[PDB]
């Protein structure tokens, strides 16, 4: 599905897909992503924001910026034209100051996903077992506690379901104080498709979907990184 | 080719490196081959010997007036490639290379050349850096390990040399009947996947146990494809070496490789239906139970015990394995209440009271096994002065015979020297017996764990 | 209280002995005599003129002597009468074998038993027990096996059949015993009282307890006493009911309420107690703790002739929170004088699969003598170039010649010759096991006790 | 004597101390609490807030209201007089509606404690072991995952320190993304004092301090419940 993005990246000596390319790529595999627009100017950012609908999110797009929040390159819940303009300039200044030698490809405009239960979905290439899908709850649960499950791809439905139920923070998905159970079927479907992406695209070394926001109905990938080899 | 029939069942085996000097490894292997009763032809290969162990010796395999299936090679590494070439000329299909001094000591190049040359003649390599192999159905002991094993249906594959050859001996002490011992060492060519394909087809093999350090890059997907289908019919138990981060880091240096992912190996084993053992003792305890019992047909597990203590240890151990006991069927309760006092507990475990005589072990076991709503039985026995351990053991044997069915049973016995004797007696009759209630319960848990592992793979293979 | 005259009585009565030798009272009297008790023994029976060649009396109060301990083996409906007579006679301890009290729902009979005994200043062990043994006093007041191996381990058991079975099993596992105490229903004397005694007892160096639960209001005292014991002697508890379902189960076997799993586990940690999840672990650890000093530091060396066993060891130690570090360079140099160049010195030290017997002696000796080595686990896989017994004798000789006292455990894997070698080592009080993981779990218990003692020292200032 | 609070509660057939009494009581044992001003009127609420300093928090105080948030009885980050007045009336109305028959003792005014790491400190009585202290991280970590540690009282410093390091969520206390390590010594001190409360006051069946906010320096008990027997 749109292998052309991977081929173009290789042809141009890039070792990764950027957020908008990564989201387009996994979207073509049936993983729900945010609507997105690459704005080259503050004016395009405003116009794209109206097209997407408020509130929106703006993010830096640059090869030299992998961790966008850490350098002030992410602004969420922008509710008006004026807030979009303010955010636009703030991001550009933050990146020029923190990453002087950064090639600014533009500013990505995307829908604002409302709060839900955050997940991480990963793909890596294991020397022995090949493409392997990773799952965990978002934030501290994977990043600090390292609570992750793995299944070697391709995944069956049995693999996807059991690897979800397996993680220690699983109960965050089945209802707790102030939060309804989220759509486990949509998660399973995303995990299987992540496995297919790895099986079918040998030039993909890693994929990181962090975070994926899960809702009572469906999920939505809010950030995406694909690393090539 | 990938057909190992004539590796395990050769008509002719050559031993290259046997000597008039009997202390040499080639000579030890030749001695074992003869001692263990190989019925095919054996060809000692030595540069000068007229004969070795009463058998005509030849200077090279290619001079043998016969088609040699397997050449067991026990010469120094600087002599191996030459022998491979002659074996090639002679058309030998398998080179079993005892010789050390290849990749495990940094000579990757010599090892890769070994395999290239072998493949160039349509010849496969086992090893190198191995202690050989044994196949009981063919009365074939091509190792320099112990001369004998107990015959049975367990195939043991070992990536480790010293631990492998030691465990070969340990099977005898633990009464484990063996169909095969295979030292795979450096795994330069033939590996676990090839061997699993053979033991899958082998009617003599009912259980496969593997001591595994790691598999080769790019080999894991096929490992899962083969292992998962084998697991539908035969349990695979893996002793994983480097199952901890520190063990994997350390073990990485054992042969000088990259540390394999602990977590991903564990998932691969789960997707393969494989049981991972964290110790030798668990591996052997489970192997024994799986070797000698059918898989339970349901979840109606009964524990029979004299006195509550052993029963509680059993309950806790089963729970740690995610096995929970349910109240026994009323039909069984009434049957047992025909001889048990009213102060007995029937909650499951069934407590026939600490001072139960020998006879109640016979009657309780028989009643349980015969009951249609009982799928499996663990019998626990604490030695006191009112019983005899051997009497209890024989009561269990007789009950299993008279029940006439085949339901999984494990036995735990706690006591002094007489209990050690009774447990040995039971194991020699292929009744899985252990000297503590927890080991008896863990062994029964392996039967259920294998049923669950198989169910995982089946669910994974379910047609849409 | 003082249990001196329980464990070292000058006079013991057996109530319920009979001309019928099959009866439990009679079995106890037999054990008492055969095991060699030197004090006075008074069979008590309603009609017998004599039993086992000893003058028999109809009541303890008729005995022309002061009886310290009365072992009571009569039916429950006869116990209170005997308690009254014993009370009249001034006996200090009633060891009540008899079942049919709280464990079968007769809580009131049990409480009446204790209050009647207390009214005479008399303490109760049990009821519903198989008795007790104290080796230093050549005292076998049980109907269990006639003999045990002598040593420094005291075993307390809340369970009857499992306890008496394990009493026998100590012999198979070569565990030397100072005491066996069946406590059963724990209506009066309990683990706290016994720990207080074994704390002072120079004959006892290790205490192992099969514990289902303790009485309401008794846990705080349990921690206070246990933690103090732990400063000098390791306590290993086999906890019955370590799981929710297990705790419920065990609860009805004794007729109690199920105790909090998590809070018991906390109490053990606060006490410096090692919790074993199985008989095998409890016995393996007891053996090691009985025969070794605690490590003085973390410089643990693993010596192996095969990398496989070494990896199994490394993994097992790691599961117990024990991590190996590089060996001292001086040890490496010493061992490099006889070892091939392809040997690994990362720790475990791999002397290679082709090591002859002699290298086990030299390696074990070098390690134990090295001042920057605190502990040693030696692992041996049988091959044709060695003999298990030769390796075993080499380890014995190395341990003697080192002349010091550092913890050692041994793992040996192989056939019947290895089983013999392991037995040989154990009969010499060298902790030997038939797998590397068990040798390593045993060494781990030494470090766990070192850490537990440290916990308690810090907790007590 | 702080014990008067317990005696008065028993005399009046109450089975618990209410927030202001509970905080006063544990404060007398040296556990840090919030200001506790009991306002009888909207006017008193305003005056107390000005004295305490903004921002403030308002809470319902009533024997019939154990879970105050669940019935809309808690208002935080109130930064002005008018906002205090709004919240005051808002709380009263919420309680009138959700718990018609509630005896309103008043409205508690307290500082709004800045965000930190939330903890739970508990006290219960075990049949075997007597007073026992419980520790865990706040929110889902205790309430959903049941990640707690216990030490039987009295606690030594070693007991307090080890029970903290023991819980699976311990690393939340020692520095993670966007959060400094918190003051372990202040937590230990509070745990020891909780144990002493349990040892000395036999009429206390349970105590629940949920949440206790931990900072790089010090802690602050923000809610407190004491159950009597
Ligand atoms: C393979 C190994 C055992 C050979 O060592 P070795 O027996 O001492 O070596 P030798 O030089 O004596 O060779 C053995 C015999 O083969 C003979 N030989 C050598 N080249 C030969 C050839 N091309 N064809 C036939 N015989 C040959 C030698 O002459 C000698 O016979 P002899 O006694 O009549 O002279 C050794 O090199 C080795 O690798 N050992 C380690 C094995 C190991 O650890 N495996 C792992 C399992 S734990
Ligand atoms: C204690 C127990 C063993 C006694 O049973 P018992 O020996 O069959 O009972 P008996 O009626 O025969 O009493 C034993 C003897 O004491 C005698 N006796 C009775 N009352 C007596 C008294 N007041 N003073 C002295 N002797 C008395 C009886 O006459 C009998 O002797 P005899 O053979 O000369 O008639 C039994 O009641 C019991 O509780 N057993 C359960 C033990 C158990 O399973 N525990 C679990 C741990 S594994
Ligand atoms: N479309 C969106 N809707 C809502 N929140 C979003 C969002 N995109 C990003 N965020 C939030 O902002 C955080 C940082 O954004 P990214 O994950 O894209 C940047 P980074 O991982 O490179 O620092 C996300 O983890 C999420 O909390
Ligand atoms: N003084 C204060 N400072 C900061 N936050 C506070 C606070 N008082 C309460 N909170 C916050 O408000 C939440 C609800 O308050 P309570 O814990 O008192 C009400 P409840 O548990 O009875 O429903 C707390 O969990 C905490 O997040
Ligand atoms: Ca991200
Ligand atoms: Ca609260
Ligand atoms: Cl020749
Ligand atoms: Cl040849
Ligand atoms: Cl048992
Ligand atoms: Cl008489
Ligand atoms: Cl009497
Ligand atoms: Cl070993
Ligand atoms: Hg020859
Ligand atoms: Hg050859
Ligand atoms: Hg085996
Ligand atoms: Hg038993
Ligand atoms: Hg008499
Ligand atoms: Hg008496
Ligand atoms: Hg013991
Ligand atoms: Hg070994
Ligand atoms: Na404090």
UniProtKB/TrEMBL annotation, chains A, D:
Binding site for ADP: 59, 68-69, 111, 113, 225
Residues forming coiled coils: 78-105
Pfam families given in the database record: ATP-grasp_5 (PF13549)
Claim: Calcium is one of the keywords in the record: yes
Organism domain of life: Archaea
Domain ATP-grasp: 23-59
Swiss-Prot/TrEMBL keywords: ATP-binding, Calcium, Coiled coil, Ligase, Metal-binding, Nucleotide-binding
Signal peptide start-end: none
The keyword Ligase appears for this protein: yes
Binding-site list for Ca(2+): 210, 223
Gene3D superfamilies in the record: ATP-grasp fold, A domain, ATP-grasp fold, B domain
Amino-acid positions noted as binding Mg(2+) in the UniProt annotation, renumbered to this chain: 223
Any one GO molecular function term: metal ion binding
Name of this protein: ATP-grasp domain-containing protein
Protein source organism: Korarchaeum cryptofilum (strain OPF8)
UniProtKB/TrEMBL annotation, chain B:
Domain CoA-binding: 7-102
Residues given in the record as CoA binding sites: 19, 24, 46, 98, 100, 130
Binding positions (ADP): 129, 159-162, 254, 308-309
Chain sites annotated for binding Mg(2+) 3: 254, 351
Binding site for Mg(2+) 1: 66
Membrane-spanning ranges: none
Binding positions for Mg(2+) 2 per the UniProt entry: 213, 254
One GO MF term attached to the UniProt entry: metal ion binding
Residue sites binding acetyl-CoA per the record: 19, 24, 46, 100
Record organism: Korarchaeum cryptofilum (strain OPF8)
Key words, A-Z: Metal-binding, Nucleotide-binding
PANTHER family: COA BINDING DOMAIN CONTAINING PROTEIN, PEPTIDYL-LYSINE N-ACETYLTRANSFERASE PATZ
UniProt name for this protein: Acyl-CoA synthetase (NDP forming)
InterPro entries: CoA-bd, Ligase_CoA_dom, NAD(P)-bd_dom_sf, Succ_CoA_lig_flav_dom, Succinyl-CoA_synth-like
């Amino acid at each position: 599905s749109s292998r052309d993005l991977l081929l173009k990246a290789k042809e141009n000596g890039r070792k990764s897909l950027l957020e908008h390319e990564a989201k387009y790529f996994i979207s073509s595999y049936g993983i729900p992503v945010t609507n997105i627009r690459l704005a080259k100017s503050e004016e395009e950012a405003v116009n794209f924001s109206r097209e997407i609908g408020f509130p929106v999110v703006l993010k830096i797009v640059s090869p030299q910026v992998v961790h966008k929040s850490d350098v002030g390159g992410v602004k969420v819940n922008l509710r008006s034209e004026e807030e979009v303009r303010k955010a636009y300039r703030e991001i550009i200044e933050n990146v020029k100051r923190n990453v002087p030698n950064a090639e600014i490809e533009g500013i990505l405009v995307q829908e604002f996903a409302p709060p839900g239960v955050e997940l991480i979905i990963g793909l890596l290439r294991d020397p022995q077992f090949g493409p392997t899908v990773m799952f965990g709850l978002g934030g501290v649960f994977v990043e600090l506690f390292r609570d992750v499950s793995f299944r070697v791809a391709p995944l069956s439905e049995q693999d996807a379901e059991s690897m979800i139920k397996e993680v220690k923070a699983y109960k965050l998905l089945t209802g707790f104080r102030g939060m309804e159970p989220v759509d486990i079927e949509a998660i399973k479907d995303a995990l299987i498709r992540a496995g297919r992406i790895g099986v079918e695209n040998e030039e993909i070394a890693e994929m990181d979907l962090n975070p994926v926001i899960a809702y009572p109905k469906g999920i939505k990938v809010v950030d995406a990184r694909i690393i090539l080899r | 080719m990938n057909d190992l029939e004539r590796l395990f069942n050769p008509s002719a085996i050559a031993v290259v490196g046997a000597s008039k000097d009997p202390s040499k490894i080639g000579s030890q292997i030749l001695r074992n081959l003869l001692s263990y009763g190989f019925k095919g032809k054996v060809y000692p290969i030595n540069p000068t010997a007229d004969e070795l162990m009463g058998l005509k010796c030849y200077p090279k395999v290619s001079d043998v007036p016969d088609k040699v299936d397997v050449a067991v090679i026990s010469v120094p590494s600087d002599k191996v490639l030459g022998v491979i070439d002659d074996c090639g000329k002679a058309g030998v299909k398998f080179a079993v290379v005892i010789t050390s001094g290849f990749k495990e000591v940094g000579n990757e190049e010599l090892e890769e050349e070994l395999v290239r040359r072998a493949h160039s003649y349509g010849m496969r390599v086992l090893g190198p850096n191995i202690f050989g192999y044994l196949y009981a159905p063919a009365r074939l002991n091509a190792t320099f390990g112990p001369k004998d094993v107990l015959s049975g249906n367990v195939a043991f594959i070992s990536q480790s040399g010293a631990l492998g050859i030691a465990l070969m001996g340990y099977t005898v002490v633990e009464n484990i009947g063996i169909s095969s011992i295979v030292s795979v060492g450096n795994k330069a060519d033939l590996d676990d996947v090839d061997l699993l394909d053979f033991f899958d087809k082998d009617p003599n093999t009912g259980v496969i146990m593997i001591y595994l350090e790691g598999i080769a890059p790019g080999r894991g997907r096929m490992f899962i494809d083969v292992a998962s289908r084998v697991s539908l019919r035969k349990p695979i138990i893996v002793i994983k070496a480097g199952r901890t981060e520190v063990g994997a880091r350390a073990a990485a240096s054992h042969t000088g490789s990259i540390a394999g992912s602990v977590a991903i190996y564990e998932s691969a084993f789960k997707q393969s239906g494989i049981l991972m053992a964290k110790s030798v003792e668990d591996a052997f305890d489970w192997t024994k139970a799986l070797s000698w019992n059918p898989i339970p047909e349901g979840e109606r597990l009964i524990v029979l015990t004299n006195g509550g203590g052993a029963g509680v240890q059993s309950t806790d151990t089963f729970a740690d394995n995610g096995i929970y006991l349910s109240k026994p069927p009323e039909s069984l309760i009434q049957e047992i209440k025909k001889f048990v006092p009213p102060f007995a507990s029937f909650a499951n475990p069934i407590d026939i009271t600490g001072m139960a005589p020998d006879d109640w072990y016979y009657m309780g076991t028989l009643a349980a096994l015969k009951n249609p709503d009982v799928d499996a039985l663990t019998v626990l026995y604490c030695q006191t002065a009112v019983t005899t351990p051997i009497g209890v053991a024989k009561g269990i044997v007789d009950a299993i015979k008279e029940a006439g069915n085949s339901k999984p049973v494990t036995v735990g016995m706690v006591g002094g020297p007489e209990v050690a004797e009774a447990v040995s007696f039971l194991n020699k009759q292929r009744i899985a017996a252990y000297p503590t209630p927890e080991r008896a319960s863990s062994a029964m848990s392996a039967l259920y764990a294998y049923a669950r592992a198989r169910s995982y793979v089946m669910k994974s293979l379910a047609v849409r």
